[PDB]
Design a protein around this ligand. Structure first.
Ligand SMILES: CNC(=O)c1cncc2[nH]nc(C(C)C)c12
Length: 293
């Protein structure tokens, strides 16, 4: 009933019709917090696309599903996953989007050791995406390795906008407790009204993923890790001796407890650490299909 009501709402904003009419060979390739991801073949072309399928009845905040169509309509960009169409299919929202065949950054940080050229490439690409989003008041709010996808040729794109929000003159700060515990900014855990700064903190934690292979406190259960992030000084690299002074200096601009003193995306784009960034090709050897070839 509220379900039926919500379906009818989603229909108002999505494309008409049914992509099963033009896609074949759905194969499940992963699951996130809002739904599953399949690849599919476009029948006419043989081209591959990704289809995110999000059940309207299995969301913590089902109104956040509108984030998909806000981003799709308004905030497309070369470092954001291309989103082609959205549909209401039975009790699910489907988004047909680009297939990022280089996979998620998670697989790389789990199995591989990135060098600083590679790390600098990912950070530069993400910061390009964030500078543009933040300038328009869009906060991603779930920055972590799982949200960073790669093309086959090593180009970096943000994905998983399901938890994003907008700030504006009339709504200058957000308050919602949103994100993934280990990556959450301390002001957000503290329930202080917050802005785009929270994404810069989360990026800092992703740098720690890239250097150490996991976020701080990853062995603690989530409710307990958030307490630690809230209460303690900024987390430290397990492997400080393994990072250049340039990278440590960069990281120290991200993991600042006071949001007003944290570097902004625009400022971070000028950091000397990012001069180390290799081209997309530098990332390609880390990918599953290449690293044991
Ligand atoms: C883990 N996340 C996803 O699987 C995903 C999410 N949104 C868009 C996508 N395009 N291509 C993929 C996979 C190939 C990584 C995705």
């Amino acid at each position: 009933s509220s379900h039926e009501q919500f379906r009818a709402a989603l229909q108002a904003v999505v494309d008409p019709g049914d992509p099963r009419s033009y896609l074949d060979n759905f194969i499940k390739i992963g699951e996130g917090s809002t739904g599953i991801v399949c690849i599919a073949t476009v029948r006419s072309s043989g081209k591959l696309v990704a289809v995110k399928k999000m059940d309207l009845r299995k969301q913590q905040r089902r109104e956040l599903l509108f984030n998909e169509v806000v981003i799709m309509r308004d905030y497309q960009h070369e470092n954001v996953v291309e989103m082609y169409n959205s549909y209401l299919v039975g009790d699910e929202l489907w988004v047909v989007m680009e297939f990022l065949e280089g996979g998620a950054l998670t697989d790389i940080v789990t199995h591989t050791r990135m060098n600083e050229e590679q790390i600098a490439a990912v950070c530069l690409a993400v910061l390009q995406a964030l500078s543009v989003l933040h300038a328009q008041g869009v906060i991603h709010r779930d920055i972590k390795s799982d949200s960073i996808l790669l093309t086959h040729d090593g180009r970096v794109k943000l994905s998983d906008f399901g938890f994003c929000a907008q700030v504006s003159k009339e709504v200058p700060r957000r308050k919602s407790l949103v994100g993934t515990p280990y990556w959450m900014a301390p002001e957000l855990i503290s329930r202080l009204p917050y802005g785009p700064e929270v994404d810069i903190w989360s990026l800092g934690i992703m740098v720690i993923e890239m250097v150490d292979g996991e976020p701080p406190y990853f062995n603690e259960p989530p409710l307990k890790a958030m307490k630690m992030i809230r209460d303690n000084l900024p987390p430290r690299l397990k492997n400080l001796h393994k990072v250049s002074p340039s990278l440590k200096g960069f990281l120290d601009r991200l993991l600042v407890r006071d949001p007003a003193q944290r570097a902004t995306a625009a400022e971070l784009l000028k950091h000397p650490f990012l001069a180390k960034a290799g081209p997309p090709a530098s990332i390609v050897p880390l990918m599953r299909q290449n690293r044991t070839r």
